[PDB]
RNA sequence: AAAAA
RNA sequence: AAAAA
RNA sequence: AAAAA
């Protein structure tokens, strides 16, 4: 609406091509107490994640006899947003903690550890669009940093639509002012989707163009995750 | 058609290791999906005769196995035994009747055998997916650790510290030490063995 | 603080029963004789809750949902002075299911509220700029409260139908000045551009099933919901559940969902009188 | 005060005689998951009730060794009232959940089921005066629909005073604007009162006139409860 | 959400002791030698809480209740612009009894607050139209906080006496304009028309006992409280407890209650200086 | 700032010398149900305390194997303050409940009673400065009234600075308007400090002058505690 | 240098009793810090030969000791025994097999032996810092209290009620009574013994 | 309601390990080779949190704390119309330590917030009268949120450094009228008179140790923190922990603390660029 | 394991 | 043991 | 089983 999202030169507000990702930076083992940890930055969106466990889950009737229980928290610091965010969990945070947990549930080989919990705490230090996915990937990386067995790593990206153009990896302006916003996460080697949402509106053809563009970004991100994890042994 | 894709490679979750119907023992560090094998962890791909495995490079928990010698930290003194921290996802328990060699007596309740903050060297007598690990103090050189230090490391790193045919063990004990399956080691005058054994944690992937 | 945990989740359906539910999936039909793409019997009783400004009791199989609206005059949010408000609340009542307990909405009920809210919002079905009374100064707030009375499976789809129905059913009253609502005088109905539907597809092994019942939800790997307006723009998507889906499963699910939306929209319209 | 409650013709705002009840409608087995359920309508006041149990009460130290614990919830939907009611439980709801539970405690033969809980959830779908009693009766009917053994059914009514006249089964206007409002519930065959409240003011003679009129209404209601329960087997 | 549960309720009084408490009921007297219609010793210390605007420490046997009031100037509720406010809060402190725990008021404490609030309100003892300062614009809010320090049985009756006492004891201060309360200048007392009393009668098998103590409350089938003003209008009734009462028990209870109210009112008046 | 705290005659707003305490009054066994209780008044600051226990702590995983758990509550009644205090616990109350508990932890011989809890509830009936200490001392006295074994009694006082003058036992005005406020509590016979705080500002020399003056007041208070406890047997 | 500072004095927590290296048995009512002894309680300083003690004047709980005869209130009837209130910081338990004299049977579940609200006279068979007190009904004149009253007092006050060489006991039973270690006493036609026994609670420090 | 309980507190450090930590205390040095009066390595990364108005990531050994500020225009509190606001919140994140759980701040986190708040407030480091925009009508509220990411011991001292750092780092923006914050235009920095430091000294048997690490905190009898400004006025004191200290221990602790403050202040100033 | 439906 | 990062 | 009492 208010701002032009696709400029006359065909480029976006931040100068990117529609199939171009924001830059990515990843740190592992950033916390001393956590069993595993990571910081993931995608553009100016930055999360930190910490994993503890597996460890026996003390309210035992909440435990699972054949499985580890994943306990996940998506939280935004009050200074992560343009206007101060109240630290009390919001409905969004509650929904996103579930969506992220369920994404992790497909990856973590929880059946190794009957009666345990694996805690995953994620805090968003800077929110500039796509924090649920940055958060989820930080989680994947921290689980791996903790040596918790997993099917695959999780890479994800929001594709969307801006001034009628399918774009890859939205920024704030595009998130606030665009026509569509579609976070997708996968286990890329297993061709399995673990998180999938859309808000806004798209024709079915557009939805499919966008999904197709997500997979390209996701695989670029996956390769950066792999190399990030390998880095300290190289 | 049955092959392997890597030499001694640094490996990562989801990473393809091999294709074909191998006859490999189950491991937590590998995932077989039909005729493909994948790494579940950040680790080291290694091959042995016609089999293969991932050596995890990462991980701070110990997964119990029966007959492992393990050094535990007593956490709670219960009415009929003691709850022990063996650095696993499950707490271990040592029953009083084991450490004593007979049933508890009316006039007991001492912790003079074991208290909170004591270490115990012990063997896992019982464990499986359904139950928490049960300990026995029977064997020689088991029970309360009176003297010594206890250095903590990743259980994942224990085979490196022993070293193929107890050879790292040798090059430690020639300069300075019991290595438990637990990522804990028991141990002259303030010689800093640990400054070394930490260096092996943080360089296991080399030489 | 708070955190999302894997449910320690009661519904231990028998091994035996799993085999049976999918047995006839090969013939394209289900436990209740219905086609894999069919919805359960749908009924919609409007004006069910008489002190609600608009209301709709929805019955979709054994799932039962009562949505009702209350309208209040309000300050517009200062960042959107030329719009009225829509506030969606879903409650999974402990009446609905034995293992629901009473408390503030849990994560499932909040997610329900939010998926419905997005669908209504992103569809442009309800144009909030139509809800202004004096711009800058005063507008309508539509409180949409959605109460799940019976959990028979696929509550999201039934929440979405009850919501639209209740919104279409919403009476609007004269506003007198001096500002006051005279409730003896209904001047209009809530202005909607069109209905919206949410269509939930469950993955059950090799099969995709529309509008899963309680047993089907107990065995499903995952579900994915697609919302449509009558022009068949996609207007919301949410995959939920602990399992993954392939890209092809999602592709196929949407194709199936959208084909079902066409029929479901026509049936909703019938119930609404539009 | 503001409106006339007793009109010149001796009748009330809704046309009723002072000893005349509002109309009553009852449905049983309305919910598929509940062990028992009912809808009770008295005039425009409408509640739904659902029963689950008896079933072992999981926080065992809260259980009773010789008795079932009754767990009861009186709740009002936000659209049940003229002005929207906040769904957060109010002090009134808290008091009325207790008063209703204690009324049910005299009827349910809880000593059959040591260590169990019997859950009773009541939601008010429309509130037009007397909802605590409609709620309680829906509960009685749902317990019976669940085949949970009970001493007797519970029937109740609010009597009161309006423009100096003792009236039976108050409506909103009479509740808001009257001088007295006195909900009474009983096990009518056992001549036992299970709920008894008064708000407003009455002379002792008036109190006794009103109590006497309640018992007449209660017995009319009791007969409708009995016939409602018998209906599906007739 | 939230729900009312049967208490898992500690006070397991011995079988033996039950027999003993009622033994002398035949002679019309109790464990403490008192008549079945008598109240325990009553004391009322006014101005006990010195930073309270009005206060009253009530001791009724071993029951001890401190009520205190604070007055604030406030916006009248827009639906009652020609009245001031009364807000009643009761706390059953964990000091009072071993099995009380600290938390927000539980169901018993909320019920206490509300029964007292109705009694004060429906008695017309406190005329809130007397609490207006500038009508429409500003009024007094009387915050009445009632703290149960010792649970010795029949807390409701003692809460009601402490409340009235504290209200009678409430200083009112000059209001200066420019609006501000000058607390160096007490201009009046809180205007009450008369006192009110609540009289609690317990059913113990064949017997009705006024002002039950802790042991008596442990054995009672149920209790029923009646509130009176000095003209002996009934001004509130609440049966509480898990047991039923016959119509005749209730009839008899009121007759007994009202006969006790007469005496109790005269004694309260003595303590108040009216 | 606004008021003069030290008047031209060298005296304080309430007429006291800088080394002069407010008056003290103590009552023991004031509550019938509590295992021990006390009321402590220091000037117009008045607290009541009640002790229950030792008794097995029912959420057993929160118990200690070698020790009683002390459970302590500092609470202010709404009418204890000049302006009405909301009864919901405030952050101050939360901090002060901890500070008071930890002061009691050094005195109570908790190792007598493995697996128990000892509850200590303190309510401030009048707050005129120094309520945390009045509260703590009431607690000490109630523990003793309950016959719960303790190393020593706890006596305390706030010293501070007002218009550049070191003063003993602050009042409200001095607390609100002074330069420093320093609550100190001790086990005076063991020369051990159990609570120690300062808000405001002091030079190190002033801090030491003030600490020195506290000890004098504390010993005066200690002697009154001792004689209060002895009184009913004398 | 080794002395005592008081005669038969009323005493208070933190209060100095004596200096020097005495050879005194441990008590909860006294605290030895190096060569100084202090009262932990409100009590009565008393001296016996070359030793000394504090007699607590205050305290409503009973601290269990093995072989104490104690009268309990049954609180819960568990599946294999009964949980008892003996007015201590710890609940006591009486196992069914004890009161019966044999293991439980399939067709049991009666409370006709003991229910909630029943008193039991019993002996403590087992207790220490680690476990809750276990009861036995074996001895003569133990088990369910059918007849009588039960008067409750401070356990601290029990030695006064017995009286040196059961002499207070005598002056009670000559006018009107079993005194348990528990601060409870079991007991013609409505003679008010209790009005007296309460007076001794609230005057123990005199004559 | 709510209440403070003795922690049932996990960190069961081995007997063996206690002996070792203090072994070299005789030589004036610790487990990590450091002097009993030395702080751990300190780093301070400013502007770490880019959407914060000012921010500071503090690393003190393995303790890691991120403070960030957000400024809002606000009504002054009517009792202080010529001042702006400072609101300090500390969160002990469940990321920090295995036995921290997610919830609203617990007693330790609230105490942290309040000790830091007093120190900043009583130091007069931040003059809130400098934060006024239009007196009476509008002022700045400085929201200071302090997030403990890694619990490596002595979190209070690191919270205090992160706070000061973040406050020094706080950008202030133009205020446009018509009032609005233009965030494209930074007009100033937050005006502080000087830095403040909190210095925590732990008692370990006969020894006083500055800046205790995790193991040292596990064995300490108690800790006492002293806050200083650059003129070495004491500006806050809090003893915490379950153990007592002698008067001499406190005397000695302050002397030691203050000697350390001098060095710590100079180092903080270096990191701040003042 | 606040107040009146 | 409300809504859009 | 926010800030000062």
Swiss-Prot record, chains A, D, F:
Protein name: Exosome complex component Rrp41
Entry function: Catalytic component of the exosome, which is a complex involved in RNA degradation. Has 3'->5' exoribonuclease activity. Can also synthesize heteromeric RNA-tails. Binds RNA.
Subcellular location: Cytoplasm
Keywords in alphabetical order: Cytoplasm, Exonuclease, Exosome, Hydrolase, Nuclease
Biological process per Gene Ontology, one example term: rRNA catabolic process
Enzyme class: hydrolase
EC number(s) on file: 3.1.13.-
Extent of the signal sequence: none
Species whose genome carries this gene: Saccharolobus solfataricus (strain ATCC 35092 / DSM 1617 / JCM 11322 / P2) (Sulfolobus solfataricus)
Pfam family, one: RNase_PH_C
Superkingdom of the organism of origin: Archaea
HAMAP family, per database record: Exosome_Rrp41 (MF_00591)
GO molecular function: 3'-5'-RNA exonuclease activity; RNA binding
InterPro entries the UniProt entry points to: ExoRNase_PH_dom1, ExoRNase_PH_dom2, ExoRNase_PH_dom2_sf, PNPase/RNase_PH_dom_sf, Ribosomal_Su5_D2-typ_SF, RNase_PH, Rrp41
GO cellular component, one term: cytoplasmic exosome (RNase complex)
Subunit structure: Component of the archaeal exosome complex. Forms a hexameric ring-like arrangement composed of 3 Rrp41-Rrp42 heterodimers. The hexameric ring associates with a trimer of Rrp4 and/or Csl4 subunits.
Family: Belongs to the RNase PH family. Rrp41 subfamily.
Curated annotation (Swiss-Prot), chains B, G:
Name of encoding gene: rrp4
Name of the protein described by the UniProt record: Exosome complex component Rrp4
Localization in the cell: Cytoplasm
Residues of the S1 motif domain: 67-138
Family of this protein: Belongs to the RRP4 family.
Gene Ontology biological process terms from the UniProt entry: CUT catabolic process; exonucleolytic trimming to generate mature 3'-end of 5.8S rRNA from tricistronic rRNA transcript (SSU-rRNA, 5.8S rRNA, LSU-rRNA); poly(A)-dependent snoRNA 3'-end processing; RNA catabolic process; U4 snRNA 3'-end processing
Subunit structure of this chain's protein: Component of the archaeal exosome complex. Forms a trimer of Rrp4 and/or Csl4 subunits. The trimer associates with a hexameric ring-like arrangement composed of 3 Rrp41-Rrp42 heterodimers.
Entry GO terms, CC: cytoplasm; exosome (RNase complex)
Natural source organism: Saccharolobus solfataricus (strain ATCC 35092 / DSM 1617 / JCM 11322 / P2) (Sulfolobus solfataricus)
KH domain sequence ranges: 148-197
Keywords: Cytoplasm, Exosome, RNA-binding
UniProtKB/Swiss-Prot annotation, chains C, E, H:
InterPro entries registered for this protein in UniProt: ExoRNase_PH_dom1 (IPR001247), ExoRNase_PH_dom2 (IPR015847), ExoRNase_PH_dom2_sf (IPR036345), Exosome_comp_Rrp42_subfam (IPR050590), PNPase/RNase_PH_dom_sf (IPR027408), Ribosomal_Su5_D2-typ_SF (IPR020568), Rrp42_archaea (IPR020869)
A single GO molecular function term of this UniProt record: mRNA 3'-UTR AU-rich region binding
Keywords, in A-Z order: Cytoplasm, Exosome
Primary subcellular site in the record, as a coarse category: cytoplasm
Transmembrane regions: none
Gene3D superfamilies in UniProt: GHMP Kinase, N-terminal domain (3.30.230.70)
BP GO annotations: rRNA catabolic process
Compartmental location: Cytoplasm
Pfam family, one: RNase_PH
GO cellular component, one term: cytoplasmic exosome (RNase complex)
PANTHER family in alphabetical order: EXOSOME COMPLEX COMPONENT RRP42 (PTHR11097:SF8), EXOSOME COMPLEX EXONUCLEASE RIBOSOMAL RNA PROCESSING PROTEIN (PTHR11097)
Protein role: Non-catalytic component of the exosome, which is a complex involved in RNA degradation. Contributes to the structuring of the Rrp41 active site.
The family this protein is said to belong to: Belongs to the RNase PH family. Rrp42 subfamily.
Quaternary data: Component of the archaeal exosome complex. Forms a hexameric ring-like arrangement composed of 3 Rrp41-Rrp42 heterodimers. The hexameric ring associates with a trimer of Rrp4 and/or Csl4 subunits.
Stated name of the protein: Exosome complex component Rrp42
Lineage of the organism: Archaea, Thermoproteota, Thermoprotei, Sulfolobales, Sulfolobaceae
